[PDB]
Amino acid sequence: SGAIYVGNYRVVNRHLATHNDWANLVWEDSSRDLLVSSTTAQGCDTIARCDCQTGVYYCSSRRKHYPVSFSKPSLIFVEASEYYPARYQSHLMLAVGHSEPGDCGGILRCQHGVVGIVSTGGNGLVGFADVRDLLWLDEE
């Protein structure tokens, strides 16, 4: 579990969005595993605006943050998980590391701020849904 809290936006994995998220929906994309909802209180996070390929992510199933190198966001085939069938996922970055389903929502961060959230795992990789292209998160 986990979210990004930027301005008056909550960014969550689409598959973990609540009824309240859907009732306060700003934007969602199943192909990216992302959903954004509106918040009453302003959030503490800053979105990275960069093309870094190194950062640190939080792994809940280890209670640990790991430094990783990761691929640039791409359209990637993802094998079946507990929460999605085998399918193509867009705007996905991969790193070598541990990820189980409950790790989804952990933040990946670089020197510029939040890069994305854990979205995929298995076979010794962790996949992250990028948010750095979502420039509208920074205003309004």
Q: Least distance from C-beta 86 to Zn ion, angstroms?
A: 31
When CB distances are held under 5 to 8 angstroms depending on the partner's kind, the choice from ligand UVS, Zn ion, none that residue 110 binds is Zn ion
Smallest gap from Cβ 25 to ligand UVS, in A, equals 4
Q: State in angstroms the smallest separation of the CB of 109 from Zn ion.
A: 8
Concerning whether 51 is annotated as a catalytic residue, the answer is: no
Nearer to ligand UVS (CB atom), residue 25 or residue 50: 25
Interface residue with ligand UVS, options 2, 7, 8, 26 (CB under 6 A): 26
Single out the residue of 137, 75, 66, 135 nearest to residue 95, CA to CA.
66
d(CA 33, CA 43): 21
CA 137 to CA 106: how far, in whole Å?
18
Distance CA 55, CA 32 (A): 20
Residue 118 to residue 48: CA distance in whole angstroms: 15
Q: Does 22 bind ligand UVS (CB under 6 A)?
A: no
Tell me, yes or no, if 65 is annotated catalytic. no
Residues in the chain: 140
Contact between residue 49 and residue 58 where contact means Cβ atoms under 8 Å apart: no
- Binding site as annotated, residues for Zn(2+): 50, 52, 110, 112
What are the catalytic residues? 15, 33, 104
